[PDB]
Amino acid sequence: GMAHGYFLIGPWTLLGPLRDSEYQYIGGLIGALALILVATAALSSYGLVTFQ
Amino acid sequence: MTELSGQPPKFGGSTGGLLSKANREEKYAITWTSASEQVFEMPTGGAAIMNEGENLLYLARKEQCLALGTQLRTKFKPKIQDYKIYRVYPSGEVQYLHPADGVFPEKVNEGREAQGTKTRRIGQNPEPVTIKFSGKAPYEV
């Protein structure tokens, strides 16, 4: 998670819609946090189904 | 069933062989006796070398073993009609599959019980409306 969340900042930070605003880094951060939340849900669901 | 013997064919490896299913679910084995070291087509792609004497080979599916068996019995100078095919479970349990009673099924044999037999023509199956709200189809009755 450390590795993945660290590098997941960049894409939206430099290319997302907030890149040309005064909230470029905040927009990248928000996108990365939402992505990590969805990925956590996916990981947990996989674990819930595969180890019954 | 007991234990299986035979030497693995001379082969360097393919990507077409066994996958996780072989260890997790089921696998198949084919044994055959060859008169010499001869090249044959690997059902998973490539050419392999069978050895003189006994040969055991593990394949992913029963149809692959049967395709190899037809190739052995149809494409070799002295024909090889000696191959036996088994189903191998991950528990170590081995199950003899082919040929069932020691005789190829193409030719008749005593002591065989007919299965799937229908004592009528196709055109004598009942009408589905006569069997609806059961669970059966006109061939199952």
Partner: protein, 40 residues
């Protein structure tokens, strides 16, 4: 994006709720359901 109709703060949170939360939750429930291997 705005709205002059009554209670125009409702799409503000309902559009994310209908587009993100509702599908995520229902797909997760249906996923855990169709994969459920309880006998029967």
């Amino acid at each position: 994006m705005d709205g002059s109709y009554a209670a125009s703060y409702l799409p503000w949170i309902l559009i994310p709720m209908v587009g993100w939360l509702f599908p995520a939750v229902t797909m997760g429930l249906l996923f855990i359901h169709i994969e459920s291997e309880g006998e029967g």
